[PDB]
Design a protein around this motif. Structure first.
Motif: not given
Ligand SMILES: [Cl-]
Length: 217
Positions: A55-66
């Motif tokens: 949906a946005d850059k935030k969701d992509c970053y959260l996926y990589l952190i998890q």
């Protein structure tokens, strides 16, 4: 938010190629310096198609952190456990595991490392675990060691946890800086394992300093 079902329903070869590009982009650049167009260009996909996967850059970053958190826990459980009751013998094992996870997953580790300093958009519960999780665990271990009479009685648990946390966080980067000539190719080809004999005496030296400094006389 979570990644779209379109991202998860991608063929394994296409999704793996995208994750490799996302890891490089988020590890080589700060969150605010991350380019969506550079991702689509390197991934070899249509311009503007990134938003069909996240949906946005935030969701992509959260996926990589998890992804980094899940990978580290799975690595920690697959590693042969320490056959000891000594806190310092355990700390040497835990320091070795942390360094081995970094060498096998350098991009995931670098993204998790930058989250400690950079202004990244993570939820309160995720931010707490990233920036205060390891410190809280070391404080618990030091409080246990003071209680069982193994550590110096007047030792401040918070101060000892601070020293352990900063060493564990930075040792891996220092080992690479000291022993790896061209780390980029050495980590990619998997040749970092050939530097373990020199790196282990440093890990042992680090534990010896912390042991003499904290253990009861
Ligand atoms: Cl990685």
């Amino acid at each position: 938010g979570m990644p779209t079902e379109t991202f998860f329903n991608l063929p394994e070869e296409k999704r793996s190629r995208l994750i490799d590009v996302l890891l490089d982009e988020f590890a080589q650049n700060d969150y605010d310096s991350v380019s969506i167009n550079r991702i689509t260009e390197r991934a070899g996909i249509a311009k503007g198609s990134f938003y069909q996967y996240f949906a946005d850059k935030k969701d992509c970053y959260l996926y990589l952190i998890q992804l980094g958190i899940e990978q580290k826990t799975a690595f920690l459980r697959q590693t042969p456990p320490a056959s000891t009751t000594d806190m310092f013998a355990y700390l040497r094992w835990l320091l070795d595991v942390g360094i081995q996870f970094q060498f096998h997953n350098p991009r995931l580790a670098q993204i998790a490392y930058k989250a400690l300093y950079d202004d990244v958009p993570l939820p309160a519960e995720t931010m707490q675990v990233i920036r205060h999780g390891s410190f809280a665990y070391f404080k618990q271990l030091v409080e246990q060691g003071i209680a069982d009479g193994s550590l110096v009685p007047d030792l401040d648990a918070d101060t000892a946890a601070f020293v352990l946390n900063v060493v564990f966080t930075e040792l891996g980067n220092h080992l690479i800086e000291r022993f790896a000539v061209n780390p980029a190719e050495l980590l990619r080809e998997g040749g970092i394992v050939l530097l373990q004999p020199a790196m282990r005496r440093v890990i042992e030296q680090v534990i010896d300093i912390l042991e003499r400094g904290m253990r009861r006389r």
